[PDB]
Design a protein around this ligand. Structure first.
Ligand SMILES: *[C@@H]1O[C@H](CO)[C@@H](O[C@@H]2O[C@H](CO)[C@@H](O)[C@H](O)[C@H]2NC(C)=O)[C@H](O)[C@H]1NC(C)=O
Ligand SMILES: *[C@@H]1O[C@H](CO)[C@@H](O[C@@H]2O[C@H](CO)[C@@H](O)[C@H](O)[C@H]2NC(C)=O)[C@H](O)[C@H]1NC(C)=O
Ligand SMILES: *[C@@H]1O[C@H](CO)[C@@H](O[C@@H]2O[C@H](CO)[C@@H](O)[C@H](O)[C@H]2NC(C)=O)[C@H](O)[C@H]1NC(C)=O
Ligand SMILES: *[C@@H]1O[C@H](CO)[C@@H](O[C@@H]2O[C@H](CO)[C@@H](O)[C@H](O)[C@H]2NC(C)=O)[C@H](O)[C@H]1NC(C)=O
Ligand SMILES: *[C@@H]1O[C@H](CO)[C@@H](O[C@@H]2O[C@H](CO)[C@@H](O)[C@H](O)[C@H]2NC(C)=O)[C@H](O)[C@H]1NC(C)=O
Ligand SMILES: *[C@@H]1O[C@H](CO)[C@@H](O)[C@H](O)[C@H]1NC(C)=O
Ligand SMILES: *[C@@H]1O[C@H](CO)[C@@H](O)[C@H](O)[C@H]1NC(C)=O
Ligand SMILES: *[C@@H]1O[C@H](CO)[C@@H](O)[C@H](O)[C@H]1NC(C)=O
Ligand SMILES: *[C@@H]1O[C@H](CO)[C@@H](O)[C@H](O)[C@H]1NC(C)=O
Ligand SMILES: *[C@@H]1O[C@H](CO)[C@@H](O)[C@H](O)[C@H]1NC(C)=O
Ligand SMILES: *[C@@H]1O[C@H](CO)[C@@H](O)[C@H](O)[C@H]1NC(C)=O
Lengths: 117, 412, 191
């Protein structure tokens, strides 16, 4: 992990190579041909054309982050999923939407009873 | 007596991946050409580990993701005097987690990260902790706001004391028992929650299963990295020194044993991970079934959702697992009496419509099974079936008619 | 397919064909040429059998679940929540499939909703009236009793409710009149 320099009396820490896996994110080959590229568990300063996003899973190239939330289609991870949609057509990455937000009007003297099935 | 117990179930483990060349060959060139001649072992290992990781991602989805919509509690919090502050999330903390979930997160303890840089990669889960906590909060809000109605169709509002009356009516106790003892049951429930809050904190061996899962994964990866530095009957355990000291025609046969040893170690690791994945799948299926039955409804199965007659269950998230809080009804202080199977009044046998015939020693009453509530034996509490000479153990008594004296007083 | 592809490897030998090796060299090192092929093929066979055993262990659990679902959902009505489909279970039908079974679950789902005002008990003559089965429902003016899963209002009579205790212990009790079906017929026909 660490060594002493033999000439100057100095601590040096050693960290091995970054490496990692590369994955490709695509829709069906009849829908489109453009793809996105994921480099797993690396920082985006070590990857070498814009649209480069940093994720807890890794570095994503070829997809743009959108603040909207949708259902997950192609899962990357850490709550991040990608999809192919318009905005003409492009691959986007977003945070998962768990579902529609609902409020139930609870009260101490109110009940709801179905009238049809 | 109202009792509240725990049950801890693991749901998933860590997702891992390994490289073909990097683990077996330390970036050597001729080592790759020698490994290429063997075949396609690491293709099968890669497919097996990818399937394991996908299965582990599906395991948490099958348990927590069971609600259609995300529910919230009303801003005012008064549920019939029942006090749910220990399980609802606290907005003051930046992570919306209950004190129980914070205690479970702090109890499980997750240089060794830099050692796993020889081709081993740990992949993050698809669902993070906040998202699982949002599922848990939605399930809690649905089960304390709408009862079991949201698990079947759309959520229907109902007051919580009336929901408790419905749950009592499902275990054989009439609903007047609750409404006459509301404060006592609320106090018992609050005391049970207060005791179970620090019951987990007092004993350090309660969360054994999740710690066992993380320790098994850690020691498996650790012993794989240990075995990477073995010799397997060769002159050296490092490739760069052995290739640079002998000529290739002997270096080839000398490193072939290293190839075989590291390959066999990889096969053993993959097989052990597959067996552990099968066990974790079985545990996750059990947890999903328990979430579907105990939380979204009332279960008639004996000793399934806790000890005693089941009333409710509450889910909590834990590192690589789920914790069920089972609320059950337990009987208490007993009294014995003399009983009879039937009552003979006018040559007709009278059987109880529901309940049991009881006597203190002088008079006879009929009461419900799970609670002492004596009532006068009338003609509406019993039904007539047959004569008096066929049932053994039948006794002498009278049955009050609520109809005859009203007529013989009012008509005359 | 992977087993058959792996059959054509060398495993460090001079050739992948047994007859080619056997017609090429003399025995006393042709045997050590073919021993590596033997080791590779035994390793391949053991790997295949282990994978098949694990997959069969998974298939057994799937088949046990299918048999349990056939016994419970098809041959009877199941009260287990979210076992035989979503909603209140009614029926199930089996169909065969290549290496599997398909269950068609027929269930009951509530559709249209209305809210009312509710009370836990009814006070009539200083006595509490609890529902025999159902729930007390007010549209705004009068009070009815109805079953839980369907709206069917009925007049609160003395046969729909039962008496338990006085009118001082239940929180949320309301005033109403419980109609006795007995006394008007006996106040009309006796006189
Ligand atoms: C319950 O819902 C059903 C549909 O699920 C309603 O039936 C519809 O009735 C209208 C009015 O007569 C017809 O135009 C539709 O064709 C019917 N639909 C079907 C599928 O038959 C029914 O009326 C509803 N019941 C109540 C009491 O509102
Ligand atoms: C529900 O339980 C909580 C936790 O015991 C109660 O909060 C406590 O309230 C008392 C009285 O003000 C304080 O001294 C404690 O410090 C509080 N505890 C915490 C953890 O905040 C809460 O009052 C209960 N709810 C009701 C309505 O009684
Ligand atoms: C319960 O009541 C019946 C009322 O008929 C009793 O039976 C009679 O008992 C008297 C007194 O011994 C006899 O003279 C009658 O012949 C009996 N009648 C019949 C039909 O057997 C009966 O003894 C009472 N006690 C029990 C324990 O059954
Ligand atoms: C609540 O339901 C009752 C059912 O009796 C309604 O009262 C009836 O209303 C109809 C429609 O005007 C009249 O024809 C009947 O004579 C009423 N019955 C009685 C006994 O007075 C009542 O209107 C409903 N309330 C609301 C707000 O809809
Ligand atoms: C209706 O409910 C009220 C309470 O809301 C009852 O009023 C009480 O009646 C008793 C007996 O007459 C009095 O001692 C109490 O002082 C009353 N309480 C209040 C707050 O006024 C009433 O009895 C119920 N019934 C009727 C027919 O009005
Ligand atoms: C080696 O030389 C450098 C030259 O600056 C000196 O600083 C260092 O102290 C020398 N080595 C030792 C062991 O002192
Ligand atoms: C990537 O490296 C840059 C440059 O050092 C650093 O500022 C940044 O925080 C790093 N990103 C992550 C996610 O660690
Ligand atoms: C019902 O609800 C209100 C508002 O939440 C609450 O304060 C009140 O105590 C309840 N009503 C009565 C009559 O107790
Ligand atoms: C209750 O049981 C005890 C022994 O446990 C017995 O002595 C007693 O008589 C019983 N009481 C009645 C009323 O039968
Ligand atoms: C049994 O209960 C009745 C209820 O009226 C009571 O009169 C009788 O005294 C009780 N028996 C004893 C032994 O107390
Ligand atoms: C039913 O609920 C709505 C809101 O969902 C509310 O405005 C309305 O007053 C409720 N109706 C009754 C009769 O309580």
């Amino acid at each position: 992990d660490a060594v002493r320099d033999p000439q100057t009396l100095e601590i040096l820490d050693i960290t091995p190579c970054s490496f990692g896996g590369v994955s490709v994110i695509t829709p069906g080959t009849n829908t489109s041909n453009q793809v996105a590229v994921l480099y797993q568990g690396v920082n985006c300063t070590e990857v070498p054309g814009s649209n480069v996003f940093q994720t807890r899973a890794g570095c994503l190239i070829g997809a743009e982050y959108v603040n909207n939330s949708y259902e997950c289609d192609i899962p990357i991870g850490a709550g991040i999923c990608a999809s192919y949609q318009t905005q003409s057509q492009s691959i986007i990455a977003y945070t998962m939407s768990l579902g529609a937000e609902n409020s139930v009007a609870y009260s101490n003297n109110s009940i709801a009873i179905p009238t049809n099935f | 007596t109202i009792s509240v117990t725990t049950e801890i179930l693991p749901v998933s483990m860590t997702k891992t991946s390994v490289d073909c060349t990097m683990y077996i060959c330390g970036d050597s060139t001729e080592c790759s050409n020698l490994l290429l001649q063997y075949g396609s072992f690491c293709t099968q290992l890669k497919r097996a580990l990818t399937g394991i990781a996908v299965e582990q991602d599906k395991n948490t989805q099958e348990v927590f993701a069971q609600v259609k919509q995300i529910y919230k509690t009303p801003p005012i919090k008064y549920f019939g005097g029942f006090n749910f502050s220990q399980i609802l999330p606290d907005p003051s903390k930046p992570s919306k987690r209950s004190p129980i979930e914070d205690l479970l997160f702090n109890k499980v303890t997750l240089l060794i990260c830099a050692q796993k840089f020889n081709g081993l990669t740990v992949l993050p889960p698809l669902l993070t902790d906040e998202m699982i906590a949002q599922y848990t909060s939605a399930l809690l809000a649905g089960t304390i706001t709408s009862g079991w109605t949201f698990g079947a169709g759309p959520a229907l509002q109902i007051p919580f004391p009336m929901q408790m009356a419905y749950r009592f009516n499902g275990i054989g106790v009439t609903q007047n028992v609750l409404y006459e003892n509301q404060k006592l049951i609320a106090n018992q429930f609050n005391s049970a929650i207060g005791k179970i809050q620090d019951s987990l904190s007092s004993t350090p061996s309660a969360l054994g299963k999740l710690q066992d899962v993380v320790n098994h994964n850690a020691q498996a990866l650790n012993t794989l990295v240990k075995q990477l530095s073995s010799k397997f009957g060769a002159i050296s355990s490092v490739l760069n020194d052995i290739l640079s000291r002998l000529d290739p025609p002997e270096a080839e046969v000398q490193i072939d044993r290293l190839i075989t040893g590291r390959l066999q170690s990889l096969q053993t690791y993959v097989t052990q991970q597959l067996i552990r994945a099968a066990e974790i799948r079985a545990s996750a299926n059990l947890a999903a079934t328990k979430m579907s039955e105990c939380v979204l409804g009332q279960s008639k199965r004996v000793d399934f959702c806790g000890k005693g007659y089941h009333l409710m269950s509450f889910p909590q998230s834990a590192p690589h697992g789920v914790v069920f809080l089972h609320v059950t009804y337990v009987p208490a202080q007993e009294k014995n009496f003399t009983t009879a199977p039937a009552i003979c009044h006018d040559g007709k046998a009278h059987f109880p419509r529901e309940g049991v015939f009881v006597s203190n020693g002088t008079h006879w009453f009929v009461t419900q099974r799970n609670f002492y509530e004596p009532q006068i034996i009338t003609t509406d509490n019993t039904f007539v079936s047959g004569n008096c000479d066929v049932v053994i153990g039948i006794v002498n008594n009278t049955v009050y008619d609520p109809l005859q004296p009203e007529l013989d007083s009012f008509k005359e």
